[PDB]
């Protein structure tokens, strides 16, 4: 029985980056070649593995994380990166092995008027640890004055929205991203490729 990659890439709904998703894939056969050979991804790099070897490999688990960011934020998904998305929304670790896959969703996630359902976290008292996920809505105290939470004031709401319009530059267009994470523990493997 084949793996549910289609459930991950073709999901009609994809999360907001601050509330990114994670599906655990196990006990199936993965023909990764359906992914790396696809001309439709705008971005496709594996780290610590050469994409050739994926179909000849066997992992204990595979973890698909999925979200939507804007075009010029995609350079931040990769490990060792900093900036808004890496510091406050989604952070890969430095020892990361796995692939980062992206593709422009402007036809899917843009609406005439702007699609505001996609949000990102603008402020945080400290950086995320790798793979931490933060869905707080507490009011950020950027300033020395204590905030009573109820009000904005000089304190700020933490989540800001992407204004996703079709006519935006390619930098400010939605990009669905999937991050595969390959875990090899000293347990019998459960996700292999067709050649393995």
């Amino acid at each position, epitope marked *: 029985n084949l793996c549910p990659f289609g459930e991950v890439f073709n999901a009609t709904r994809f999360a907001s980056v601050y509330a990114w998703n994670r599906k655990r894939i196990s006990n199936c056969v993965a023909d990764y070649s359906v992914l790396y050979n696809s001309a439709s991804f705008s971005t496709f790099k594996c780290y610590g593995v050469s994409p050739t070897k994926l179909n000849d490999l066997c992992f204990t688990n595979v973890y698909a994380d999925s979200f939507v960011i804007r075009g010029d934020e995609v350079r931040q998904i990769a490990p060792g990166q900093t900036g808004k998305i890496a510091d406050y929304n989604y952070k890969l670790p430095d020892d990361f092995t796995g692939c980062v896959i992206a593709w422009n969703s402007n036809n899917l996630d843009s609406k005439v008027g702007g699609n505001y359902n996609y949000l990102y976290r603008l402020f945080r008292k400290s950086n995320l640890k790798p793979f*931490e996920r933060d*869905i*707080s*809505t507490e009011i950020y105290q950027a300033g020395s004055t204590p905030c009573n939470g109820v009000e904005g004031f000089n304190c700020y709401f933490p989540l800001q929205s992407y204004g996703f319009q079709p006519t935006n530059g390619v930098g400010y267009q939605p990009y669905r991203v999937v991050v595969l994470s390959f875990e090899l523990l000293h347990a019998p493997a459960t996700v292999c490729g067709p050649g393995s």
Partner: antibody, heavy 124, light 113 residues
């Protein structure tokens, strides 16, 4: 039977250092992460540190960040807590609790087993 | 940090009668894989804590099935169905995915008299 047996606590003058040991048995120490949790007399539980199954990562509570240093020895099945520049607010009972099996990148439920604690009293 | 707020610390109970403790988090607790990594610990007098419930509602091995976890989002609940006298002490809740990894303040359970 799984066992976690801390030692090394006692009376430490402020500003000085103390090193605590947690000797694990009954399970493959190498396979799980580990945690140090402290309880001050009469108060609730406060998480101190975390180490990864393989030692790769160490995360600290900001109250001890910069002063405490977690470390394990997978050959001798022993977790360690190195406490430096001890303040009075650090007076507590220190527990080790088992972490998750595997990488704390992906497996999160933990604190399934706890040691008996070792008492650390910082006074002059 | 994620603030864990427990039920009132004094929770005097009648033996043989159900009791229940409320844990409430400052943010919603579901993680990216859709699990909620909230634990329930019991600390008897002069003892180190024991885990009763992991993942909101899953009972740890050797825990009597009167103990029950439930809840979702920001509001959680440990429930005992028939309090016995062994159940005396302090009960802490805990979140497992936010890095501060804070715990509840604790709820003390005493016999009602």
């Amino acid at each position: 039977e799984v066992q976690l047996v801390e030692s090394g606590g006692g009376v430490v003058q402020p500003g000085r250092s103390l090193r605590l040991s947690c000797a694990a048995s009954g399970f493959t120490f190498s396979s799980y992460g580990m945690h140090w949790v402290r309880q001050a007399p009469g108060k609730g539980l406060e998480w101190v540190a975390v180490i990864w199954y393989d030692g790769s990562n160490k995360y600290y509570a900001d109250s001890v960040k910069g002063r405490f240093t977690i470390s394990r020895d997978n050959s001798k099945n022993t977790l360690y807590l190195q406490m430096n520049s001890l303040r009075a607010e650090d007076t507590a009972v220190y527990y080790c609790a088992r972490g998750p099996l595997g990488s704390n990148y992906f497996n999160y439920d933990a604190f399934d087993i706890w040691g008996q604690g070792t008492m650390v009293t910082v006074s002059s | 940090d994620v603030v864990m707020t427990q039920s009132p610390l004094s929770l005097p109970v009648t033996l043989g009668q159900p009791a229940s403790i409320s844990c409430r988090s400052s943010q919603s607790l579901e993680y990216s894989d859709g699990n909620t990594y909230l634990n329930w610990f019991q600390q008897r007098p002069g003892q180190s804590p024991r885990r009763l419930i992991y993942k909101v509602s899953k009972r740890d091995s050797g825990v009597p099935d009167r103990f029950s976890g439930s809840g979702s989002g920001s509001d959680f609940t440990l429930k005992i169905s028939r309090v016995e006298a062994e159940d005396v002490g302090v009960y802490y809740c805990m979140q497992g995915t936010h890095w501060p990894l804070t715990f509840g303040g604790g709820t003390k359970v005493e016999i009602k008299r």
